[model samples]
Target: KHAHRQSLETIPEVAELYHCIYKLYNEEESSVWFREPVNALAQEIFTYYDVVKSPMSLRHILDNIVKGDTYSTALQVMEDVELIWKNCITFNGANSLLATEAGKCRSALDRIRRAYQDDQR
Candidate 1:
């Protein structure tokens, strides 16, 4: 018996969702880094993207931010998120690969956050 490989065409919804998340992440990062609040939100958004299984859920991203010491580091988190998003979008094409590439980005972001959090303790 031969193993069958799934075609990319079969998961168009997943592909589309990946593209949407990539684009939105880029756009939001680009538009709001200058503003403190938005920047903070963006960082939290990035953090959510950092840990979640799926990078498409913006609400979950925000929720993670809120849960993780939103009061003090909110602005910084937003700035970091925006920066990461901007860098990723600029370097990677907005496609399914973006989601895969995000794994590395998320790893880096998580490291930074962990280091910062540790310092805070």
Candidate 2:
């Protein structure tokens, strides 16, 4: 008997990075708030469309990764991942609970990203 693991992308590096960050968000409860389009999650964030010109989400990021060619570099993926936090903080204000939770997730993401980048160097 043999085990099989589905590939997320043709590129090994990108696939690994995607799985790593995707898993990070999947395991987090706060990430639920960032898993969908802002407006789709709540009508109260209708202004979110005007405020965040380019909203991003964990699901979108994962979709791009699995689609391939969307992120040629790990840094590109990191940029999109950061957007989730940036959009939340920008729309909700830094003092807001959503912003605080996003900051915590971003901190963890940043640490992992740094270590992964360092390993590549």
Candidate 3:
């Protein structure tokens, strides 16, 4: 659970990177044809885990998270995001609080986005 949680924790930062990169690639929010930039984003993530023919990345990004590294290959993808792999290795805690954190932060990002959109109007 420790390694699992550590990798998951970095997702929010990665997502923020995506928001910035979208502007870098597509240039405007109103520009809606997303084939290339999305492919670019997928490549960025694929470069992270460096998994091939791996469906686990699909569900891994979703709610169907696993309990341990048996399903995780985040080291290749997460190196820049981590202070050190040792931090990923050394951890001790019940992961429920940490697991719950991801969802809460997801919801918070949604709310913040919606609020920003509202203010933009």
Candidate 4:
């Protein structure tokens, strides 16, 4: 049997929390911010969560926070998510953390979208 899936619908709060965290990840990963390793690590942690099958317990998520990988690692993870968000999700917005830059964000989004589209075709 599958673990009780925490529906992204049922747990609006969890989705919101992840969104906020992703926003911060975006800022830190972007070239405009200080290029630190912590951001990369945070991003990676988030990506792991995104791709995982089991619903994450609060404790599990907290454990990652406590581990506190370096900024570069977090940023690297964020970069991965950014690619997924832009391309696969096809998300678009002006104020979105991923949309702040005029054209920079589009490249990642476009790349991901094209890859997914190609796979489907």
Candidate 5:
């Protein structure tokens, strides 16, 4: 089997965790904050890492997240994405260890909507 890992090595902060552990920064969520919230969505949609995140054929991860259900639903209306994001985030708040990745998943929805809305109007 092959292992693909980023170069950075983080010292273990928890005794429960192991040293030399492979770590990945949540850079996906670091993109234009208001532009999209693919990282947070991906973790939910995929649910299982072993399945969607298998070694090969994972290059489409970014595309899948961008053109995902959350993205589509978020564009349905001004309220759609905001509400969904709120619910998702509320769920994230209690479910995660660090609830620090605050993103504006709503604005991206508006941008896409208004980008085409005027022409259709």
Candidate 6:
């Protein structure tokens, strides 16, 4: 058996987490905010990069997975998913509409993570 993880696709937990990310990314309404990187000039979000220093998008994460060799562990996948949530809430204030939707995504992620953790015990 291989000792170290070769890729996210080879790991059952990470693959399942990626499937949830794909589903969320494809959602028509609520997930629109996280589909792609914020367009600073186009959207007039001048301070976007400044505030969201490590910007993340569902598209980017998907692209990484498509490359088929980016991630090694489930925790790494979890971290990226959390980054998308964190960036959304950081750029859009907690009281804003997008932030509210971000919370929904966060809830799903928390549930998935918790279930995975329980299975490991």
Off by over 4 Å in 3: 1-95
**Model 2: residues with Cα > 4 Å off, grouped in runs:** 1-42, 110-121
Which ten contiguous residues of candidate 4 have the minimum total lDDT? 1-10
lDDT string for model 6 (4-118, tens) is: 3334655788777776777677755677766776663366465786677898888888899879898888778779988998888777777878887988888987888899999
Model 2, 26-119: lDDT tens digits are: 6766676776676666766677788898999999999999999799998899899888988898898888888988988988887988899999
lDDT of 4 by residue, 1-121 (tens): 1233333574788878866655565555454444345556566566655654343333543465577762347465455445543443333344655555535645665788789999999
Task: Please give the clash total of every predicted structure, in order.
Answer: 5, 0, 1, 22, 0, 0
Better structure of 1 and 2 per lDDT: 2
Report residue 57 deviation for candidate 4 (angstroms): 26
- What TM-score quantifies how close candidate 6 is to the native fold? 0.51
Q: Which sections of candidate 1 miss by over 4 Å?
A: 1-73, 76-80, 83-91, 94-99
For model 5, how does the per-residue alpha-carbon lDDT over 1-121 read when each residue is reduced to its tens digit? 1253433365545422422222222223433334335566565555533433222222343454566743354344334434444544455563443233324334554566688988798
* Candidate No. with top lDDT: 2
Backbone clash pairs in model 3 (N, Cα, C under 3 Å; residues 3+ apart or in different chains), count: 1
- Assess every candidate by TM-score: 0.24, 0.54, 0.24, 0.19, 0.29, 0.51
Q: What is the lDDT of candidate 5?
A: 0.42
**Residue 29 alpha-carbon offset, candidate 2, angstroms:** 20
Instruction: Give the Cα lDDT of each candidate.
Output: 0.58, 0.81, 0.44, 0.52, 0.42, 0.76
Error of 4 at 82 (Å): 15
Q: Which candidate is the best by TM-score?
A: 2
Write down the TM-score for model 3. 0.24
Give candidates' CA RMSD values in order: 17.1, 18.9, 20.5, 19.8, 13.4, 20.8
